[PDB]
Design a binder for this molecule. Structure first.
Ligand SMILES: Nc1nc2[nH]cc(CN[C@H]3C=C[C@H](O)[C@@H]3O)c2c(=O)[nH]1
Ligand SMILES: Nc1nc2[nH]cc(CN[C@H]3C=C[C@H](O)[C@@H]3O)c2c(=O)[nH]1
Ligand SMILES: [Zn+2]
Ligand SMILES: [Zn+2]
Lengths: 358, 358
């Protein structure tokens, strides 16, 4: 396989489906990437993650640099070897968590150069440029300032990535668009990123307090500013309905802690909407979490059993809920991909929303 | 298969190896039974428990009657169906946890009749008689009193078990020997239990504060008092070296929370003795937990990785440590069984101790 190749197999309106080819494997898009916080996808073995249908997972640069440490992971053979996942891994830049001067942030120090270096040490396949994230809400002036600084940092990220032969030859680098909710700033950011040139483009600075309406509004004008022939990554999104709407607006890649996090909380996603398995109504319910879900949990265990485990604080409860939720997300992405390929994604989105919010 | 059949295939001194045949499967002895506290073997799917080599697991009557409740479990199809384990399950009587009058204990009420009933509701394959457990230390007089009461309760358990057709035809009932550390009391208890007649006999009231020397001393005279042709079950034992010594003294069945419990704590069992994986010396150790262990954890993950997970409080750390420890226990039982079959258990025990305590 090549270092990086994105090919669009089918389109319906702004929606696209296709594949990203990388050295460690193929990523089907639109893609959902389970999040590995501390070199583990919470409560799941890597084989189980893969079995749900995930093609790629996300590693957190901020957490890993603190524990166990980027240099230590490199010494142990890199993140893939360390955690036992041999498929692609995307690493975030640390910009969101660390949230200062033009050189970078101290807190430990983090700069475009150090972020790139850490992601190299981890052996990341998709490296994220180091950005400054504009809080929401933000004045036009402050958003411009942050966006401008992030573009300077994007250039610095690009140069640091390119200066490392092994990294430049084997990994990909994504730039991150900023600019808050302002069309002009988004435009300038997109223009700047494209001038620099990246393998993929992320829409950053969303899902930070604004509602879905506003997020969708910003996506409407922002995604078409990005190069059409490269992947579009919406960071930290999100709920199933957020995902469907973002694909309708041209997004190809997603990540969120939601399915793992809310799993441990007792929230299970279903085609009829989320349920909280702790609710007493499930104490004697012999049905699986979802009657259509094809995951291993739904094939074997009842709502009543999982209800009991989650109420009792048992680790197996977290394991089963997380597997289900991640498998649900992958099934959602599969149905999205199929519907786009078949030119019926518009209908799928409508049918999906009608049932999920019934 | 029959309701219950124990056959002794081979002997070396007091040690025996063989099989217990039951409707839901065959149990190879000497056997180690992982403990399921709240209808789950902590941090493991039933398939994973089985994959380690376990033939039977233990369910706790006291915990299950409180949550989710014995009647509810029956309504949901019984414990096997509820938790997804279809092989034999032994249930304890609740006597130890609940630790009063001749009728039983209130705290909820527990009597020989209610204990038997609860174990019927769970659908247990091996039912334990309801006993009174003598605290350690105990005067000769108090131990006699408790032992005498437990024998009266053993009769009541027997009659309650026999009064339920479905239970008597499909499950087995074990009596429990008491009598503290006193040979005469142990003798009277064994005589009483045999007069009543049970499918198996447990040595109760040990591992309650006495040392290994004293436990072994009591086992020396107590196990030969029990019927030779029936299984001998030492409850709540124990460490690997306890197990080897107890088999040398004629014990066929074991259970302990140790491998699960100490797993989550960071303690990993190895042929060279236990290690605590949290120790800084393992932070960059690329070796598996045990260099000889054939378990899935040891095939894939390093000491360094598990060290990181356990220090970070990650659920996967608990999962991997517990799988390893349970697999270690099963490998220990397999080596014991093989050595007895080959008439070299004496040598195995010696070699085992030399290395484990080196
Ligand atoms: N570097 C970076 N990481 C991020 N994670 C999540 C977001 C926005 N949601 C974000 C970003 O805007 N930049
Ligand atoms: N019923 C009963 N349960 C028990 N669990 C553990 C022990 C002794 N260790 C015991 C007992 O002596 N009786
Ligand atoms: Zn499912
Ligand atoms: Zn192992």
């Amino acid at each position: 396989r090549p270092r990086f190749s994105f090919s669009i197999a089918a389109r319906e309106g702004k929606a696209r489906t296709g594949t990203i080819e990388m050295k460690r494997g193929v990523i089907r898009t639109p893609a959902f990437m389970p999040v590995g916080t501390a070199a583990t996808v919470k409560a799941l073995k890597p084989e189980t993650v893969r079995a749900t249908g995930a093609d790629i997972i996300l590693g957190n640069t901020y957490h890993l640099m603190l524990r166990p440490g980027a240099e230590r992971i490199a010494k142990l053979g890199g993140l893939h070897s360390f955690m036992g996942w041999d498929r692609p891994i995307l690493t975030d830049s640390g910009g969101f968590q660390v949230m200062q001067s033009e050189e970078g942030v101290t807190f430990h120090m983090l700069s475009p150069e150090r972020s790139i270096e850490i992601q190299h040490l981890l052996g990341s396949d998709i490296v994220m440029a180091f950005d400054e994230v504009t809080p929401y809400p933000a004045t036009p002036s402050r958003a411009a300032s942050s966006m401008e600084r992030s573009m300077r940092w994007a250039k610095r990220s690009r140069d640091a990535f390119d200066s490392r032969k092994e990294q430049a030859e084997n990994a990909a680098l994504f730039g991150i668009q900023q600019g808050s909710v302002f069309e002009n700033l988004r435009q300038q950011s997109a223009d700047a990123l494209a001038e620099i040139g990246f393998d993929g483009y992320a829409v950053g600075g969303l899902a930070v307090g604004e509602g879905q309406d506003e997020m969708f509004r910003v996506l409407d004008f922002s995604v078409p500013m990005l190069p059409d022939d490269k992947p579009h990554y919406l960071m930290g999104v999100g709920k199933p309905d957020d995902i469907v709407g973002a694909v309708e607006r041209g997004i190809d890649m997603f990540d969120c802690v939601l399915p793992t996090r809310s799993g441990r909380n007792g929230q299970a996603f279903t085609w009829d909407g989320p349920i909280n398995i702790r609710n007493a109504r499930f104490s004697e319910d012999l049905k699986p979490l979802d009657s259509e879900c094809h995951c291993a949990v739904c094939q074997k265990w009842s709502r009543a059993y999982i209800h009991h485990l989650i109420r009792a604080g048992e680790i197996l409860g977290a394991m089963l809920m997380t597997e289900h939720n991640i498998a649900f997300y992958q099934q959602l992405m599969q149905k999205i991909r199929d519907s786009i390929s078949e030119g019926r994604f518009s209908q799928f989105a409508q049918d999906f929303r009608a049932r999920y919010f019934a």
